[PDB]
Design an enzyme around this catalytic site. Structure first.
Site, PDB file in Angstrom:
ATOM      1  N   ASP A 191     -74.336  46.440 -13.927  1.00 55.21           N
ATOM      2  CA  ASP A 191     -74.683  46.796 -15.298  1.00 55.21           C
ATOM      3  C   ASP A 191     -76.088  47.372 -15.539  1.00 55.21           C
ATOM      4  OD1 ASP A 191     -75.682  44.203 -14.781  1.00 55.21           O
ATOM      5  OD2 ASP A 191     -75.171  43.477 -16.809  1.00 55.21           O
ATOM      6  N   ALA A 221     -61.442  44.891 -18.787  1.00 55.28           N
ATOM      7  CA  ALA A 221     -62.453  44.831 -17.721  1.00 55.28           C
ATOM      8  C   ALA A 221     -63.138  43.470 -17.707  1.00 55.28           C
ATOM      9  CB  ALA A 221     -63.447  45.979 -17.813  1.00 55.28           C
TER      10      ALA A 221
HETATM   11  N1  LIG Z   1     -75.473  42.361  -6.093  1.00 54.05           N
HETATM   12  C1  LIG Z   1     -75.385  41.918  -7.365  1.00 54.05           C
HETATM   13  N2  LIG Z   1     -76.406  42.185  -8.220  1.00 54.05           N
HETATM   14  C2  LIG Z   1     -76.347  41.768  -9.501  1.00 54.05           C
HETATM   15  C3  LIG Z   1     -75.165  41.024  -9.982  1.00 54.05           C
HETATM   16  C4  LIG Z   1     -74.101  40.766  -8.988  1.00 54.05           C
HETATM   17  O1  LIG Z   1     -73.074  40.118  -9.295  1.00 54.05           O
HETATM   18  N3  LIG Z   1     -74.281  41.237  -7.740  1.00 54.05           N
HETATM   19  N4  LIG Z   1     -75.106  40.605 -11.265  1.00 54.05           N
HETATM   20  C5  LIG Z   1     -75.987  41.253 -12.228  1.00 54.05           C
HETATM   21  C6  LIG Z   1     -76.030  40.475 -13.502  1.00 54.05           C
HETATM   22  S1  LIG Z   1     -74.722  40.708 -14.571  1.00 54.05           S
HETATM   23  C7  LIG Z   1     -77.034  39.620 -13.758  1.00 54.05           C
HETATM   24  S2  LIG Z   1     -76.908  38.612 -15.114  1.00 54.05           S
HETATM   25  C8  LIG Z   1     -78.256  39.556 -12.863  1.00 54.05           C
HETATM   26  C9  LIG Z   1     -78.830  38.149 -12.719  1.00 54.05           C
HETATM   27  O2  LIG Z   1     -79.876  38.323 -11.765  1.00 54.05           O
HETATM   28  P1  LIG Z   1     -80.742  37.144 -11.115  1.00 54.05           P
HETATM   29  O3  LIG Z   1     -81.657  36.609 -12.186  1.00 54.05           O
HETATM   30  O4  LIG Z   1     -81.347  37.669  -9.827  1.00 54.05           O
HETATM   31  O5  LIG Z   1     -79.638  35.994 -10.925  1.00 54.05           O
HETATM   32  P2  LIG Z   1     -79.219  35.170  -9.609  1.00 54.05           P
HETATM   33  O6  LIG Z   1     -79.242  36.069  -8.401  1.00 54.05           O
HETATM   34  O7  LIG Z   1     -77.942  34.453  -9.943  1.00 54.05           O
HETATM   35  O8  LIG Z   1     -80.388  34.073  -9.442  1.00 54.05           O
HETATM   36  C10 LIG Z   1     -81.677  34.571  -9.137  1.00 54.05           C
HETATM   37  C11 LIG Z   1     -82.664  33.420  -9.087  1.00 54.05           C
HETATM   38  O9  LIG Z   1     -82.579  32.651 -10.292  1.00 54.05           O
HETATM   39  C12 LIG Z   1     -82.992  31.357  -9.898  1.00 54.05           C
HETATM   40  N5  LIG Z   1     -82.695  30.321 -10.906  1.00 54.05           N
HETATM   41  C13 LIG Z   1     -81.555  29.624 -11.071  1.00 54.05           C
HETATM   42  N6  LIG Z   1     -81.639  28.753 -12.110  1.00 54.05           N
HETATM   43  C14 LIG Z   1     -82.893  28.881 -12.608  1.00 54.05           C
HETATM   44  C15 LIG Z   1     -83.680  28.275 -13.703  1.00 54.05           C
HETATM   45  O10 LIG Z   1     -83.195  27.363 -14.408  1.00 54.05           O
HETATM   46  N7  LIG Z   1     -84.932  28.716 -13.898  1.00 54.05           N
HETATM   47  C16 LIG Z   1     -85.499  29.682 -13.147  1.00 54.05           C
HETATM   48  N8  LIG Z   1     -86.766  30.075 -13.425  1.00 54.05           N
HETATM   49  N9  LIG Z   1     -84.832  30.287 -12.124  1.00 54.05           N
HETATM   50  C17 LIG Z   1     -83.569  29.927 -11.827  1.00 54.05           C
HETATM   51  C18 LIG Z   1     -82.336  31.098  -8.547  1.00 54.05           C
HETATM   52  O11 LIG Z   1     -83.060  30.112  -7.813  1.00 54.05           O
HETATM   53  C19 LIG Z   1     -82.357  32.477  -7.927  1.00 54.05           C
HETATM   54  O12 LIG Z   1     -83.390  32.592  -6.947  1.00 54.05           O
HETATM   55  O13 LIG Z   1     -77.960  40.079 -11.558  1.00 54.05           O
HETATM   56  C20 LIG Z   1     -77.402  41.386 -11.646  1.00 54.05           C
HETATM   57  N10 LIG Z   1     -77.360  42.022 -10.346  1.00 54.05           N
HETATM   58  N1  LIG Z   2     -69.121  30.726 -14.855  1.00 59.04           N
HETATM   59  C1  LIG Z   2     -69.864  31.851 -14.921  1.00 59.04           C
HETATM   60  N2  LIG Z   2     -69.529  32.765 -15.841  1.00 59.04           N
HETATM   61  C2  LIG Z   2     -70.231  33.899 -15.962  1.00 59.04           C
HETATM   62  C3  LIG Z   2     -71.367  34.187 -15.068  1.00 59.04           C
HETATM   63  C4  LIG Z   2     -71.662  33.156 -14.064  1.00 59.04           C
HETATM   64  O1  LIG Z   2     -72.608  33.305 -13.260  1.00 59.04           O
HETATM   65  N3  LIG Z   2     -70.889  32.051 -14.055  1.00 59.04           N
HETATM   66  N4  LIG Z   2     -72.060  35.355 -15.195  1.00 59.04           N
HETATM   67  C5  LIG Z   2     -72.135  35.850 -16.562  1.00 59.04           C
HETATM   68  C6  LIG Z   2     -72.791  37.194 -16.642  1.00 59.04           C
HETATM   69  S1  LIG Z   2     -74.458  37.201 -16.292  1.00 59.04           S
HETATM   70  C7  LIG Z   2     -72.119  38.316 -16.947  1.00 59.04           C
HETATM   71  S2  LIG Z   2     -72.948  39.790 -17.201  1.00 59.04           S
HETATM   72  C8  LIG Z   2     -70.622  38.296 -17.141  1.00 59.04           C
HETATM   73  C9  LIG Z   2     -69.974  39.384 -16.312  1.00 59.04           C
HETATM   74  O2  LIG Z   2     -68.595  39.412 -16.680  1.00 59.04           O
HETATM   75  P1  LIG Z   2     -67.725  40.697 -16.237  1.00 59.04           P
HETATM   76  O3  LIG Z   2     -68.578  41.920 -16.073  1.00 59.04           O
HETATM   77  O4  LIG Z   2     -66.550  40.721 -17.167  1.00 59.04           O
HETATM   78  O5  LIG Z   2     -67.270  40.312 -14.744  1.00 59.04           O
HETATM   79  P2  LIG Z   2     -65.908  39.693 -14.167  1.00 59.04           P
HETATM   80  O6  LIG Z   2     -65.599  38.360 -14.803  1.00 59.04           O
HETATM   81  O7  LIG Z   2     -66.019  39.803 -12.691  1.00 59.04           O
HETATM   82  O8  LIG Z   2     -64.762  40.700 -14.690  1.00 59.04           O
HETATM   83  C10 LIG Z   2     -64.987  42.097 -14.617  1.00 59.04           C
HETATM   84  C11 LIG Z   2     -63.628  42.734 -14.402  1.00 59.04           C
HETATM   85  O9  LIG Z   2     -63.779  44.143 -14.630  1.00 59.04           O
HETATM   86  C12 LIG Z   2     -62.923  44.863 -13.714  1.00 59.04           C
HETATM   87  N5  LIG Z   2     -63.453  46.235 -13.724  1.00 59.04           N
HETATM   88  C13 LIG Z   2     -64.592  46.688 -13.142  1.00 59.04           C
HETATM   89  N6  LIG Z   2     -64.807  47.976 -13.451  1.00 59.04           N
HETATM   90  C14 LIG Z   2     -63.826  48.338 -14.307  1.00 59.04           C
HETATM   91  C15 LIG Z   2     -63.444  49.539 -15.030  1.00 59.04           C
HETATM   92  O10 LIG Z   2     -64.119  50.587 -14.950  1.00 59.04           O
HETATM   93  N7  LIG Z   2     -62.356  49.441 -15.813  1.00 59.04           N
HETATM   94  C16 LIG Z   2     -61.563  48.378 -15.896  1.00 59.04           C
HETATM   95  N8  LIG Z   2     -60.486  48.419 -16.733  1.00 59.04           N
HETATM   96  N9  LIG Z   2     -61.847  47.248 -15.256  1.00 59.04           N
HETATM   97  C17 LIG Z   2     -62.948  47.196 -14.480  1.00 59.04           C
HETATM   98  C18 LIG Z   2     -63.076  44.094 -12.430  1.00 59.04           C
HETATM   99  O11 LIG Z   2     -62.002  44.401 -11.518  1.00 59.04           O
HETATM  100  C19 LIG Z   2     -63.129  42.647 -12.963  1.00 59.04           C
HETATM  101  O12 LIG Z   2     -61.833  42.025 -12.957  1.00 59.04           O
HETATM  102  O13 LIG Z   2     -70.062  37.071 -16.674  1.00 59.04           O
HETATM  103  C20 LIG Z   2     -70.736  35.929 -17.193  1.00 59.04           C
HETATM  104  N10 LIG Z   2     -69.900  34.782 -16.907  1.00 59.04           N
HETATM  105  S1  SF4 Z   3     -74.411  48.747  -8.217  1.00 56.01           S
HETATM  106 FE1  SF4 Z   3     -75.112  50.737  -9.027  1.00 56.01          FE
HETATM  107  S2  SF4 Z   3     -76.148  50.245 -11.014  1.00 56.01           S
HETATM  108 FE2  SF4 Z   3     -76.036  48.339  -9.812  1.00 56.01          FE
HETATM  109  S3  SF4 Z   3     -78.043  48.188  -8.648  1.00 56.01           S
HETATM  110 FE3  SF4 Z   3     -76.481  49.222  -7.278  1.00 56.01          FE
HETATM  111  S4  SF4 Z   3     -76.783  51.441  -7.591  1.00 56.01           S
HETATM  112 FE4  SF4 Z   3     -77.768  50.336  -9.365  1.00 56.01          FE
HETATM  113  W   LIG Z   4     -75.210  39.568 -16.662  1.00 53.22           W
END
Ligand SMILES: Nc1nc2c(c(=O)[nH]1)N[C@H]1C(S)=C(S)[C@@H](COP(=O)(O)OP(=O)(O)OC[C@H]3O[C@@H](n4cnc5c(=O)[nH]c(N)nc54)[C@H](O)[C@@H]3O)O[C@H]1N2
Ligand SMILES: Nc1nc2c(c(=O)[nH]1)N[C@H]1C(S)=C(S)[C@@H](COP(=O)(O)OP(=O)(O)OC[C@H]3O[C@@H](n4cnc5c(=O)[nH]c(N)nc54)[C@H](O)[C@@H]3O)O[C@H]1N2
Ligand code: SF4
Ligand SMILES: [W+6]
Ligand code: NA
Length: 727
Positions: free
Chosen positions: A10, A413
């Site tokens: 995102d 999604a």
């Molecule tokens: N490859 C990859 N990249 C992503 C995502 C992914 O699924 N895959 N998800 C994306 C999304 S949607 C999000 S929300 C971001 C999140 O991005 P990040 O903030 O990097 O989240 P995490 O990697 O879950 O955890 C990162 C750090 O948060 C710390 N942490 C956990 N709990 C706490 C707390 O209570 N306080 C503090 N200060 N630190 C804490 C953990 O120790 C860990 O080192 O990453 C994004 N980037």
């Molecule tokens: N328990 C728990 N819940 C969480 C989190 C967690 O760490 N723990 N993380 C939270 C955070 S930070 C975030 S941002 C949200 C993320 O929530 P989402 O971004 O909704 O991630 P997912 O639950 O993996 O569901 C995403 C779905 O989108 C589908 N998809 C991907 N690209 C496309 C597309 O172009 N079109 C369509 N139609 N489908 C697509 C994938 O196949 C997948 O099934 O979840 C939150 N919910």
């Molecule tokens: S998945 Fe795409 S938008 Fe996310 S960090 Fe990698 S290159 Fe950037």
């Molecule tokens: W997120």
């Protein structure tokens, strides 16, 4: 060569793509100087995105479930036309019996960036308020808190900051790589870095000050910082005087949080917390980039409020550190396309959550209507994600029929089964539906529970005009690389085709997504062919704080350090920290059986949420669902690093591979989010391809004790006790 917004996660780095002679799409970091995405911003998820677009298991045609029980994996291909006819017929019956409020929707629009407001438009015309999104605990909740404080969600400037404060944010070449590069650029400019993370990460190693606080205690740390900045008078006296309310009340509150107390709560040293506070206030412009950790704690509300307050009082909203967003000045607002005013007040009032956690509902946000009209010209300012049903209320209504039944459910999604807390209840809710439609790319655990699975297009197959979180003050254009594979269609195609069948054609004049795109950009006088030729379009913003500034979209027009909206709703108008109800402090007795403090999360380089686990290069990079324990902690429990374990809370358990990892602090345990096994057969016998065995939501309570009291989001980060034992 095309410029494309990568939607493999995102943060939306702009990359370059090209179709090779053999039809494979090669993606690479943009070779031209991009206005927002720094050089060398591409990660493995993007590089290998075509392995997902072309995956043999990708759903490319509508599937109808022809089994005799929901969750039975008996599927038959059908046409879009027939699927839509049947969906509309069944939805009409459901709405006639149970009202339009009986349709629930879980949508992640950032993954699709294709409907431009027409999804809520459709729901508002049908009469359903019951929209929610997994972003209820990531950015969407945060925007609500920002809005009651200063009228609009803020954005921190990596380019202009001389101090950055990171909460977690494990940035790397494969976690938000563009922002990783932004950070590195900042550091080289001389920008200071403060990192709060129990885990010593790479960013922690880069930090000028690393605060290894206890999981869940950020709110306390921030209150300590505010104590220092107020008591030392390091704040911007002019901004506070002219643009804030409730400063004296805030000043009194933070006297409850002296550094000796905060040091004890956080496990950090008082002198270091003081250094942090001083650095943050004096090394201006100072920003606190948005971070997920504080959207996921029992004390989330206060931690977010405290961050907002910190930025406000040091002058970050007036020195270039923090920018208050708006509907994009060049475009038709998504908020206006959504037609929130059309949804009758009676239906707004029914929104699930109104009776339990009203804050993020239409009702809770209603004091911001007039202020939003005044400042933004939009009464219902859909800032990032807004006017939302509470997920626990939604799944509970699905499961129990109280306070009223929800009987149709659309997942757009969104792997909704796994995307919230209390996964068992989400399963129960889905199993009590009369109609479930899943619009996705794969047979996800949620899709496995559907009546119809509808194939979505992929980011390499579509144009996009941004921003698709309304509030972001710029948009990057995304070019379409190829036509969608098979019968994959865009999100607007689905919405419009359903709207027509529901009798709403007159409200959807745009015949396809391209016409809707041209409508979004219509105030520019350009159509998409011309518009896409420029990388980025910056928005103008209102003059908030100038000598004749308009102030902010809050009840007072000023930054509410003391929140009038919270006072109104019966919540603490000021930030606080209370020990979560399940820790070694609040429940040492329980901690004898459940000795570990839980952290659910830690994003992995090769996957995004529950995405990209299909067999392939990305899955191979981290192929098992993994628990992390410090070697000493694992040793004490008799669990060899590299062996399978259960991790169990009072709510439930999941199965994980223990890998010892010295960076995980002693007495704490990491579980991953989003893990499942697409290689397995679906259906209940495999727990929906491992969903019921390996996802964090299996162990996350959404009882009131584990919910943020003001927002109704679940606590995931600290504040929960766990045990770990051999399988
Ligand atoms: N490859 C990859 N990249 C992503 C995502 C992914 O699924 N895959 N998800 C994306 C999304 S949607 C999000 S929300 C971001 C999140 O991005 P990040 O903030 O990097 O989240 P995490 O990697 O879950 O955890 C990162 C750090 O948060 C710390 N942490 C956990 N709990 C706490 C707390 O209570 N306080 C503090 N200060 N630190 C804490 C953990 O120790 C860990 O080192 O990453 C994004 N980037
Ligand atoms: N328990 C728990 N819940 C969480 C989190 C967690 O760490 N723990 N993380 C939270 C955070 S930070 C975030 S941002 C949200 C993320 O929530 P989402 O971004 O909704 O991630 P997912 O639950 O993996 O569901 C995403 C779905 O989108 C589908 N998809 C991907 N690209 C496309 C597309 O172009 N079109 C369509 N139609 N489908 C697509 C994938 O196949 C997948 O099934 O979840 C939150 N919910
Ligand atoms: S998945 Fe795409 S938008 Fe996310 S960090 Fe990698 S290159 Fe950037
Ligand atoms: W997120
Ligand atoms: Na029933």
């Amino acid at each position: 060569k095309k410029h494309v917004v990568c939607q493999s996660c995102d943060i939306n780095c702009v990359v370059e793509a090209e179709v090779k002679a053999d039809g494979k799409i090669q993606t690479k970091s943009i070779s031209e100087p991009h206005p927002t995405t720094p050089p060398n911003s591409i990660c493995m998820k993007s590089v290998n995105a075509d392995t997902i677009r072309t995956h043999k298991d990708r759903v490319l045609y509508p599937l109808k479930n022809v089994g005799s029980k929901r969750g039975e994996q008996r599927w038959e291909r059908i046409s879009w036309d027939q699927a839509l006819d049947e969906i509309a017929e069944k939805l009409k019956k459901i709405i006639a019996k149970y009202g339009p409020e009986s349709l629930g929707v879980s949508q992640t629009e950032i993954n699709q960036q294709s409907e431009y407001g027409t999804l809520r438009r459709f729901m508002n015309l049908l009469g359903s308020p019951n929209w929610t999104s997994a972003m209820y605990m990531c950015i969407g909740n945060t925007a609500g808190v920002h809005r009651v404080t200063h009228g609009s969600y803020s954005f921190a400037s990596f380019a202009d900051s001389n101090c950055l404060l990171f909460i977690g944010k494990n940035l790397s070449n494969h976690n938000w790589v563009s922002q990783f590069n932004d950070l590195k650029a900042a550091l080289k400019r001389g920008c200071k870095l403060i990192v709060l993370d129990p885990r010593r990460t790479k960013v922690a190693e880069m930090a000028d000050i690393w605060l290894p606080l206890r999981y869940g205690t950020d709110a306390a740390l921030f209150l300590g910082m505010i104590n220092v900045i107020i008591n030392e008078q390091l704040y911007d006296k002019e901004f506070v005087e002219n643009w804030c309310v409730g400063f004296e009340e805030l000043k009194e509150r933070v006297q409850e949080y002296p550094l000796d107390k905060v040091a004890e709560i956080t496990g950090c040293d008082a002198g270091e917390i003081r250094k942090a506070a001083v650095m943050f206030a004096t090394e201006s412009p100072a920003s606190i980039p948005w971070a997920v950790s504080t959207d996921m704690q029992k004390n989330s509300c206060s931690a977010i409020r405290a961050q907002c307050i910190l930025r406000a009082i040091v002058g970050s909203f007036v020195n270039g550190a923090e920018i208050l967003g708006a509907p994009h000045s060049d475009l038709v607002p998504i908020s206006k396309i959504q037609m929130h005013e059309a949804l009758p007040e009676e239906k707004k009032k029914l929104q699930l959550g109104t009776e339990t956690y009203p804050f993020l509902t239409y009702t809770g946000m209603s004091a911001l209507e007039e202020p939003s009209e005044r400042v933004y010209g939009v009464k219902y300012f859909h800032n990032m994600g807004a006017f939302m049903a509470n997920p626990t209320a939604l799944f509970t209504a699905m499961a129990t029929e109280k306070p009223y039944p929800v009987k149709a459910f659309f997942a757009l999604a969104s792997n909704a089964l796994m995307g919230y807390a209390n996964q068992q209840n989400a399963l129960k809710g889905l199993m009590n539906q009369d109609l479930v439609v899943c619009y996705d790319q794969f047979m996800t655990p949620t899709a496995q529970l559907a009546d119809y699975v509808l194939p979505g297009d992929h980011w390499l197959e579509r144009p996009v005009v941004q921003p698709n979180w309304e509030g972001i003050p710029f948009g990057n254009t995304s070019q379409q690389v190829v036509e969608p594979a098979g019968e994959a269609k865009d999100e607007y195609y689905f919405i419009r085709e359903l709207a027509v069948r529901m009798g709403l054609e007159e409200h959807f004049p745009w015949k396809d997504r391209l016409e809707l795109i041209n409508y979004r950009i219509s105030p520019t006088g350009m159509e998409w062919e011309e518009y896409q030729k420029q990388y980025t379009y910056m928005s103008k913003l209102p003059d908030y704080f100038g000598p004749e500034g308009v102030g902010v979209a809050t009840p007072s027009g000023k930054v509410e350090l003391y929140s009038s909206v919270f006072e109104k709703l019966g919540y603490d108008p000021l930030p606080y920290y209370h020990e979560p109800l399940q820790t070694e402090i609040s429940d040492p007795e329980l901690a004898k059986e459940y000795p570990l403090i839980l952290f659910a999360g830690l994003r992995e380089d090769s996957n995004f949420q529950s995405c990209y686990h299909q067999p392939g290069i990305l899955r191979d990079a981290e192929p098992d669902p993994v628990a992390l324990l410090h070697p000493k902690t694992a040793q004490s429990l008799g669990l060899p690093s590299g062996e399978w374990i259960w991790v169990e809370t009072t709510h439930g358990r999941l199965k994980l591979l223990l890998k010892h990892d010295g960076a995980q602090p002693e007495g704490t345990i990491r579980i991953p989010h989003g893990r499942w096994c697409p290689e397995q057969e679906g259906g209940p016998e495999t727990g929906f391809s491992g969903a019921m065995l390996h996802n964090d939501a299996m162990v996350l309570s959404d009882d009131d004790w584990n919910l943020d009291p003001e927002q109704g989001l679940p606590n995931l980060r600290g504040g929960i006790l766990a045990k770990a034992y051999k399988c």
